[PDB]
Design a protein around this ligand. Structure first.
Ligand SMILES: CC(=O)N[C@H]1[C@@H](O[C@H]2[C@@H](O)[C@@H](CO)O[C@H](O)[C@@H]2O[C@@H]2O[C@@H](C)[C@@H](O)[C@@H](O)[C@@H]2O)O[C@H](CO)[C@H](O)[C@@H]1O
Ligand SMILES: CC(=O)N[C@H]1[C@@H](O[C@H]2[C@@H](O)[C@@H](CO)O[C@H](O)[C@@H]2O[C@@H]2O[C@@H](C)[C@@H](O)[C@@H](O)[C@@H]2O)O[C@H](CO)[C@H](O)[C@@H]1O
Lengths: 303, 306
């Protein structure tokens, strides 16, 4: 089966690390830090990695029953799956699929239905993924909410993420620092690998969005390695990789002209030939096109 | 000549095309009491987007723009911009901005804002009542009720992220009304450029719906939300653009483990599905089941009964 990538434009696609649209493309150095996101990780032949699942609308969502912490405004959620069934902590994944893969305070609404009478409720809520109580691999997380009494026990409860907050400027979130999925009780396991360019003159290419800010002065940049639509495409197509590197051309169909070329690595990330931080300039109808299988030492034309 | 296909994703791997939530189940039921005319999740099998349909579920029922307080109240008017923060164009031949809510109801979420100059940010619980006379997205503005009367700044980029729906009143589940379109221009004019209503015409047929449950945020809302196509099918058809070789694509829903067909259905080229069934029915399916395109047929194809 011939390999392909979607023909969708950047702004027609979704971030694979938070449920927001893609905005732009960015390249920059990343030698000084670890790039190891767990969402938006998929091989070109369709093997999902890390905590990656198939739809953007499930990312950084949580479901389960909740219990109040003491008489405070905090609630513990005993996590269940997307469809309210069991999460198995023994499955060899880092945490439930869709779990946040950055240290930060994510704000949203915690909603609940009482099954007996169909009554419903919603409260502003934040999950601090750097907290010792952020233990999704153990099956629970803790939320700070705007209520100390309105949530009932034994009722289906959902967190819908909206954005991020900060306290103290732009010092958090830390998008490239993974939370400890088991808190202080254990180290992270079964992670999608860290990624880095290996060929001189190359940098990663990032698919960038801006997370909404909900309080304070947060760092709102969020970069993913693959659009969510690419994850779903590769998962479905499962086209065999004929080498370790797929050569893509980013084309302006208005003119047929190639704007730049890049390497899509089989293990699921892109590099470009560039040195330095750069906000790419792309036309609104531009898109990526797979042209040929090449190798790790093929020299890209400068971006 | 390009062969037509539908995605192989399972129902629970896909997304509702009318609200940013996962699909839960397949449902068929009677539709004679309704006009079924959703504007999101509308796309032909050869990839022509219809109504207010755009390509990603994460944008549905989102709004962006600048806000101004209404009087000295807790309500704010949002002057809409496009998804990428560029000016909105009311002259485009669509019913309303792509992604606009296509039902009458009170959608609750958070209204967030950043002050560009210093990176300061804020968020407030907010509700948009799409049945309100102030719901005028085609004209370029909608109104929100919020939990503040003072915290939002003028001239700053503001986003509404939807979460769920609310209800008020002794008549439980009286709202939202998922099959009642808003007036996109309010009282100023009638709706324009709509994707057409759909209905079964062949004896013994009903629509097949891809169903989710919207989160409830207050009161006793009707949380059912049915779409005609998963968002992933919209995206698939838009990209593939495979020519329709007849009016109807016959699909079989298959259990991949046994290879057995569970049921068959008619995917009309204009982008909706019928099945041979009468009455409300939550389909009993294996979670790994998927739809498979088998052949090009016509509107009078008599299906094996569900
Ligand atoms: C949880 C809460 O009550 N939020 C309110 C509160 O917000 C303040 C407050 O949390 C302080 C204390 O840490 O920090 C900020 O000042 C925060 O305000 C928010 O962020 C600042 C930088 C501004 O951008 C502000 O507009 C924004 O609200 O009080 C404020 C009103 O002052 C809001 O009501 C929050 O929702
Ligand atoms: C803004 C606020 O203070 N909400 C409270 C309040 O919310 C109520 C209130 O808005 C009434 C208006 O008559 O409507 C509901 O009762 C609403 O509550 C919500 O819906 C009901 C049916 C319950 O499911 C409830 O738990 C939910 O909050 O009062 C409630 C307490 O009942 C909460 O304190 C809200 O925060």
């Amino acid at each position: 089966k011939p390999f392909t990538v979607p023909i969708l434009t950047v702004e027609e696609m979704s971030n694979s690390r938070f449920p927001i649209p893609l905005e732009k493309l960015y390249t920059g150095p990343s030698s000084a830090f670890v790039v190891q996101p767990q969402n938006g990780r998929c091989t070109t032949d369709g093997v999902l990695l890390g905590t990656t699942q198939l739809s953007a609308v499930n990312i950084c969502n949580f479901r389960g029953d909740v219990t109040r912490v003491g008489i405070s405004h905090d609630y513990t959620m005993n996590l269940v799956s997307q469809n309210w069934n069991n999460y198995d902590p023994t499955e060899e994944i880092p945490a439930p699929l869709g779990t946040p893969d950055f240290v930060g305070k994510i704000q949203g609404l915690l909603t609940q239905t009482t099954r007996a009478d169909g009554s419903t409720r919603a409260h502003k809520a934040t999950v601090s993924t750097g907290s010792v109580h952020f233990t999704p691999k153990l099956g629970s997380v803790q939320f700070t909410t705007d209520t100390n009494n309105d949530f009932q026990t034994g009722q289906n409860t959902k967190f819908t993420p909206v954005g991020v907050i900060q306290d103290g400027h732009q010092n958090e979130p830390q998008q490239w620092v993974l939370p400890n999925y088991s808190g202080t009780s254990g180290h992270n396991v079964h992670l999608a690998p860290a990624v880095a360019p290996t060929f001189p003159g190359e940098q990663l290419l990032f698919f960038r969005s801006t997370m909404p800010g909900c309080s304070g002065y947060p760092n709102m940049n969020l970069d993913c390695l693959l659009p969510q639509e690419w994850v779903s495409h590769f998962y479905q197509e499962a086209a065999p990789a004929q080498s370790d590197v797929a050569l893509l051309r980013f084309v302006n169909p208005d003119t047929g002209r190639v704007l730049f070329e890049c390497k899509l690595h089989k293990s699921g990330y892109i590099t470009v030939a560039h040195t330095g931080p750069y906000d790419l300039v792309i036309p609104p109808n531009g898109y990526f096109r797979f042209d040929s299988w090449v190798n790790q030492f093929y020299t890209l034309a400068p971006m």
